[PDB]
Amino acid sequence: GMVVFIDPGHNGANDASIGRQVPTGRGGTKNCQASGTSTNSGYPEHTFTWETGLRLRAALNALGVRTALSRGNDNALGPCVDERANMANALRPNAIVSLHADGGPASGRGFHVNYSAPPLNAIQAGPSVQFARIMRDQLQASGIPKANYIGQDGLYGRSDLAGLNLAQYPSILVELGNMKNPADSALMESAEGRQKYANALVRGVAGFLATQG
Ligand SMILES: [Cl-]
Ligand SMILES: [Cl-]
Ligand SMILES: [Cl-]
Ligand SMILES: [Cl-]
Ligand SMILES: [Pt+2]
Ligand SMILES: [Pt+2]
Ligand SMILES: [Pt+2]
Ligand SMILES: [Zn+2]
């Protein structure tokens, strides 16, 4: 009955086409994709989101939740941000979760959950805000601190992310940590750390799904 769309942020590989302009959902355009960041050791964001995304997929499949991925590999060109949102909407999912990692100041540590604000539809106004709050409480529960450098108590309501703007179904974009920070990068570079993030993500997704039914 349940369908969740998981979006491991960024592509396995990029070419010049990532510079092509795509609609933002509020007028104007932005680049199709961004390369993403990396840890000081060179562990790329695209691989972190992909590996953590697979763990989240495994956890949701254990609950009998049908999952869809925004991309099927971590080594080739992937879809633009507008295509990912249109792909997700076409599935009429119960929840959409995008996974990212940030590139912030070295002392900046912790997570932030991004959601579309001001809202462009009733789903963005209510259910997506409830989903963001639930997810923020779950990451804090896995021992991931609320970001000390961005957002408000681990939340960031914002208008500039095309994927969030274009969503017709509950959708959030989770920045799991700062790849440039020693504590967050040590978690990201470890299979146990990636599993810890996936456990928080499944708890947030399940918690939200349990309120909508
Ligand atoms: Cl509406
Ligand atoms: Cl709050
Ligand atoms: Cl975007
Ligand atoms: Cl986006
Ligand atoms: Pt189910
Ligand atoms: Pt697609
Ligand atoms: Pt974006
Ligand atoms: Zn990113």
Automatic annotation (TrEMBL):
Q: Where is this region: Disordered?
A: 20-44
Among InterPro entries, the record links this protein to: MurNAc-LAA_cat, N-acetylmuramoyl_amidase_3
GO molecular function terms attached to this record: metal ion binding; N-acetylmuramoyl-L-alanine amidase activity
Pfam families tied to this protein: Amidase_3
Which residues take part in binding Zn(2+) 1? H10, E45, H100
Organism superkingdom: Bacteria
Q: Endoplasmic reticulum: is it a keyword of this entry? A: no
Please list the residues that bind Zn(2+) 2.
H46
The processes (GO biological process) annotated in the record are: peptidoglycan catabolic process
Q: Where is the composition biased (Polar residues)?
A: 30-42
Disulfides per UniProt? C32-C80
Asked if the Swiss-Prot or TrEMBL record annotates the protein with the keyword Transcription regulation, the reply is no
Kindly provide the name given to this protein in its UniProt entry: N-acetymuramyl-L-alanine amidase-related protein
Q: What is the lineage of its organism?
A: Bacteria, Bacillati, Actinomycetota, Actinomycetes, Mycobacteriales
